[PDB]
Assembly symmetry: D2
Homo-oligomer: 456 residues x 4
């Protein structure tokens, strides 16, 4: 019922051009009705992603001025190494320019062809490197996680029965590692309980199976645990995060998310053998282990942001601001995925546009409409992005045809949230007016990135 | 009824420490219950002033990086000179480190001992330099302006009958110049209509009297003209600002206000004789005419800021965010000054605390309570600031005993406004609880700046 | 005989702590006499590498303030794409966090198992990706390039007879592409003449072979052409660079070198098929094609830096400052690699320490001595870095046992060069005093990065 | 004989346009042969002044990012106050936008009409405020200080006999205060010995007279004391500065000089009465005592800069880089003022152009020639700047007809010094070629700032 005011003041702003609706319609047109083809400069509120779109603090910007760009022995690296070792509790750290860079490394080092990798759902880049290195992905998340309507807490929890069964039918020796993600993106940014992580660790530990977290949004997960897990009411975010990682053997992290930066990531591990091997591999892909594809100034900004992310008031507002958007939409009966995750709100384009068939790209059309009416860009996560089968050469028909409204950290206000909520509510009240779309140009690769459409 | 969402995104934020109510009470104690003694770091929302507390843009910060610190011929100066000439339309410009710097200059140049200076109300620093140079200030603002309850538009307007009479009982030749201020600070930030400026210029131009504006908040004034003056509904802010100045002979500007900067100001004029004399005088007070006590980077930032302030959406949201605070307070029956100005909301401490006599400093105590309860700093504008008579050595009893809630530009959100509004409304419901204050230490000079008190 | 003064002024400085010789000796001891283990903060002059250690301009820092961090459609991306298209002349560009990131991409896209890749010498990362993807590297550089004493111009040139013979003995169809590097690192930073680039292109065009440049230091190369190639005396650096690339099908670029930045790189190509395939591949390794693992601000700084690098006076001073260090050392009879390249000076550790056998690591010891005596860090490029055979498990005995003095761009002065030169000349006069080293700890991987030694 | 290398690295550079000699000649022409009219952008090396043209450090730029712009209680002010109290040892400090601002204040507070002000020579701004406030300036520096050819150390010392006599012929009660400047500008930047500061204090103390230091270049002074005063060889710069100020009652400081900043200054004092009165006066001229016309970020940069100036290596290089220029010039027989000061070199235009009469403006023409030949800008300090009498309406004929070459801190290299020294040596060897100048346009005020000339 209550939403907190920003636990910070605005130090500097990014000016935006408020173009008319007539202009937005023309721009949408030229973009082929594909929000991905829109120019950043032509967008008022950009909710395409929460990756690298964060606003830094004055302290981080101060850190950006004292970048020690030395190839080795940089003071910024020591700062990052010390901070991560202190907060995550891992023994070694290898910086990487992004989260995927770390995933490429881990997968090349922890997977042997024909092995299995079990995890609670997946993410495109992380799953790619897994399979790329000869492994078979096995989803062991609870089934309720797949129910977009089920309003249940900790939908990202792993189903221990599915895990135990896997171990039984394939053998511990055949499971490279368990990839536990926090939060679970695919499900809408759903958290994992501390009880589950503890339980999975107990089982895996019994069979000597490795556990690597995809901690890109571990602080948001930390907040849900503090908010909804019994006994964690009075535990600090910092302490919750420390315990979370005490059940993992390492992790891949995208600083571009919860580390409050615009670039940066890293790989963590306790194993010395794996650390030494990782050091040799990072050289050819990211750079020396002393900087890993990151400028010294960026390692400083990331070490600072990680620390800023631990402030309760900051994360509470971050998550509640997303909750605010979901709440407003739910109050008007707009079809969204439940419950609201920590970083975004997903709209059910299917239920939103019942007059359209998935083959008429409702999610893509909804997104286009959202921009023309409010100037906010959202990302289509439906049939268009799902792509079309290689063999049958036909469109994949994903279970969910959604439009994702992803919120960057510390960039928008509740007033901005009202602009997108009011705009979508108005669209919903006249949803029959939303037209279907058709391909006028469909590239072969990355079709969602450059395909152009036209109304049916 | 409707308030616009911020026409910008947050680029960087200023971290703030949220200290408990207990700590705030302790800090206020140590500060002698005087908000002017509180440490900036101990304040959540600082509404002490709108001067130099503005948030700059990414474009301004980029300019901050290309400062041409040359003692002469700096590129930044040319940028500023070109901008001001374009936007204000004046012939010459002399930069100064602050608005007062410009006033000191114009006063030493346009005033002759015994001459008179008429204007709509006054400001401390400006009137000082006026008198300091042997001149008598004559307030020619409409009487209604003095009525804090009269909800009347353009209260800052000049009484043309009060003027004509002045010219009559004293002689044009005895009036140095007319000091028209936009907006009028003393009344609460009230605007002056274009019709008034034009009429004043018509009369003065007749008797050859000089007109110099105090344009510190000329852009807020322009917004009121576009919003409430008939015929300007469709005129651009830029076009309104240009005409405003077409009725003046020069001006003194405080970039710290409407120029969206943290430091800076300038003096403009068309007279070449005055310009040449100004050049000679600036040398000994601010610095060369080519920089006047401002770093190159700051002249660049100010040139950029002035341009940014011309954006309608920006100024509209600026003024409306202040209106929002006023509306919320009025809705709860809190006594405030009417109508709401463009840069601040003034609380009527007299009506707020009817259980306290002015000699118990209601405004001062109201300000201390507001901080201890919400963490927001406000400024007292009553008996404590009015000081005490030199002769009678007794406290001056100002007509209005108010607490000023001044809003910096682009720094806070409506959520922030709700924090100060809900806290003052709650205080009002239990106003009888507010205690009177007493001097435990009263400096002789700048008492309001360092005086310390204690509860009665 | 003449060296030009810096074609720029200092805008900001990086403070350094000048520790004593006693302190430096203690520091060196603690670092196991390995310069790779020294803290950047304990170094006065760091000549470890010219990679990402460059000093940016005020215009570049201004650009760092206007980063459009949008996931797609960023204004900075357009700035970089337009700039590179204009200066390099390639049709398409794909940004990468670094040069290796672009190499990984090109190798995966242009090599098929069993094919051959011919080039003028090689670089560690680039060769790794070549072989990693199933190709056999063939060195076709002129034989003189291997004679470190031969003072001959354009030692980086490709031997057209070696290339023609390759095409003859293996079949044009079996040659993935020709990898022409400018300048040639391994030889000491030696240039490639325009005549050679044109001839190579003529032959390759005949057989339909692909040509991709490893342009990390193409601007330094351009200067040498302007300085020593007949007919280019009056051609602009900008025009020479455009012609160079007119003979290639694409290129991999490390912005960390000649683009005057601390991070960044990119992949260029004219072929649309390859461009489409590269776009799909960059996603999983670097990021969207619209940012490729680089923050928007960095794409802006790299675009600006590339344009700054085209100024003749800047590149002339850059190369000549390196020539200055080499001239001073040569004048004193200190053994170095000839002629001096464009980014570094290589000391011949073998001839420097004739009292030591390569097995006693002369280059590693010379490097430790240079730091203890002057406070400047250099990199060992000899037996330690060469490593030990995997099979025989024995140290590789590289032909050249050197110490590299790599000069960052726009970071040091001639006075700093005098410091390293005078210290090295002094050490040379008592070279017999340099002690041999022995491993006290030899890691299995990246041994030159963390190995620790002790005097013999 | 030996000159130290820069004790810092270049973090960022200010690019410059290297226009040809033909262009420079064209530019000088349009500037009316007056260097004060040249655009900063058309200059290579700007030696107009060392005021506010300094290069800040990466640490200072970091401080610029955390500017606490609160009107009162700013953290940056506490940082500055604490730093000055600690380094200078004074009780109170009142910041001002510039040093003049501090002079204006002190003059108004400590001078009573008719009183006398004695000091070692004078400076324009400071002397003005002295006389403007009804006081007579009495020069009590040693007579040797006026001998531009006398290579005598500590020419800035006060002749104690001249002082004692003053106190005798006028009475201590009639002497406002003693203004001791460190260093002494008018003489060329000459230092005052610690023994003299101690002596003067001992005498003034006896008669209860006041001593205020014009410490704008107190760190350069401190270096000379450490270098040439017996017994201070082993005292830290920090400790020398502390003792220096222990003999004063306060001081006016221009951070634009030795504080390594581009703007800012302050007034120091131990007297509470003066402090309180100073607080009331600053409000109307600079701003609140809590910022005094300075942005929060600038107080931070000044606090950090002051500390950086205390590094022996930095100040030694600073003074020795200027010495280097004087040494090169003297070695070629070029007529300069002796000895070389700590911040500038003065050329003797009279002896430089013996073929010209002061009436033909040799200094002004020399300055013009220096620019057309090298691209460096210098300041005319002869007849043109001396102006012409108000009564007789004729040109004043200053004792010294010089061209001042003032060096900013941390902006140029020795190579830049060679460019100016080599160009001036070449002009000297053909001095007879320097032509006389004649006014083509002479303003009445600030004639040196905008007068235009032409060759006779
Ligand atoms: C964003 C993300 C990653 C890593 O991608 P980044 O761009 O590389 O750093 C990994 N997992 C999840 C669940 C993510 O959301
Ligand atoms: C703030 C203000 C000024 C100028 O003061 P600043 O600090 O000097 O620049 C002048 N007039 C009014 C009405 C003001 O509100
Ligand atoms: C530096 C370099 C590269 C690319 O490496 P970076 O770190 O990745 O960008 C490629 N080739 C040569 C010859 C280089 O010197
Ligand atoms: C520079 C200087 C001052 C002060 O002038 P600034 O511009 O105001 O701060 C005072 N005295 C001397 C001797 C100076 O050199």
């Amino acid at each position: 019922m209550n939403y907190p005011a920003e636990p910070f003041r605005i130090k500097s702003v990014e000016t935006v051009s408020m173009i008319s609706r007539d202009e937005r319609v023309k721009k949408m047109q030229e973009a082929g009705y594909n929000t991905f083809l829109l120019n950043s400069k032509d967008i008022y509120i950009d909710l395409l992603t929460d990756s690298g779109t964060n606003a830094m603090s004055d302290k981080q910007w101060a850190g950006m001025m004292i970048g020690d760009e030395a190839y080795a022995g940089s003071e910024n690296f020591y700062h990052l190494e010390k901070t991560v070792k202190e907060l995550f509790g891992f023994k070694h750290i290898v910086p990487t320019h992004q989260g995927r860079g770390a995933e490429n490394l881990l997968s090349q080092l922890a997977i042997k062809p024909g092995q299995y990798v079990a995890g609670n759902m997946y993410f495109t880049t992380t799953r790619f490197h897994q399979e790329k290195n000869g492994a078979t992905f096995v989803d062991i998340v609870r089934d309720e996680a797949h129910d977009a309507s089920l309003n249940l807490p900790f939908k990202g929890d792993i189903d221990l029965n599915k895990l135990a069964t896997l171990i039984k039918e394939k053998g511990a020796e055949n499971i490279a590692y368990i990839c536990l993600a926090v939060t679970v993106n695919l499900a809408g940014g759903q958290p994992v309980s501390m009880a589950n992580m503890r339980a999975v660790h107990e089982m895996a530990s019994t069979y000597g199976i490795k556990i690597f977290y995809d901690a890109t949004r571990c602080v948001e997960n930390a907040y849900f645990i503090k908010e909804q897990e019994a006994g964690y009411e009075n535990v600090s975010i910092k302490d919750i995060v420390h315990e979370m990682f005490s059940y993992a053997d390492g992790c891949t992290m995208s600083g571009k998310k919860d580390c409050l930066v615009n670039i940066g990531g890293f790989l963590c591990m306790n194993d010395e053998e794996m650390f030494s091997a990782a050091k040799e591999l990072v050289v050819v892909y990211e750079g020396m282990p002393s900087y890993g594809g990151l400028a010294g100034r960026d390692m400083e900004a990331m070490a600072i942001g990680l620390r800023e992310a631990m402030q309760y008031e900051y994360i509470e507002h971050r998550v509640k601001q997303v909750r605010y958007l979901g709440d407003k939409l739910r109050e008007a009966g707009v079809p969204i995925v439940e419950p609201t995750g920590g970083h975004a709100v997903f709209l059910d384009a299917r239920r939103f546009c019942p007059h359209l068939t998935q083959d008429q790209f409702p999610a893509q059309s909804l997104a286009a409409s959202i921009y023309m009416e409010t100037g906010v860009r959202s990302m289509e996560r439906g049939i268009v992005s799902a792509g079309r089968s290689k063999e049958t050469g036909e469109n994949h028909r994903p279970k969910l045809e959604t439009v994702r409204l992803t919120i960057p950290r510390r960039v928008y206000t509740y007033a901005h949230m009202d602009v997108v909520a009011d705009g979508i509510i108005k669209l919903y009240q006249h949803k029959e007016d939303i037209r279907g779309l058709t391909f006028v140009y469909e590239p072969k690769q990355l079709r969602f990135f450059t395909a152009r459409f036209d109304f049916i």
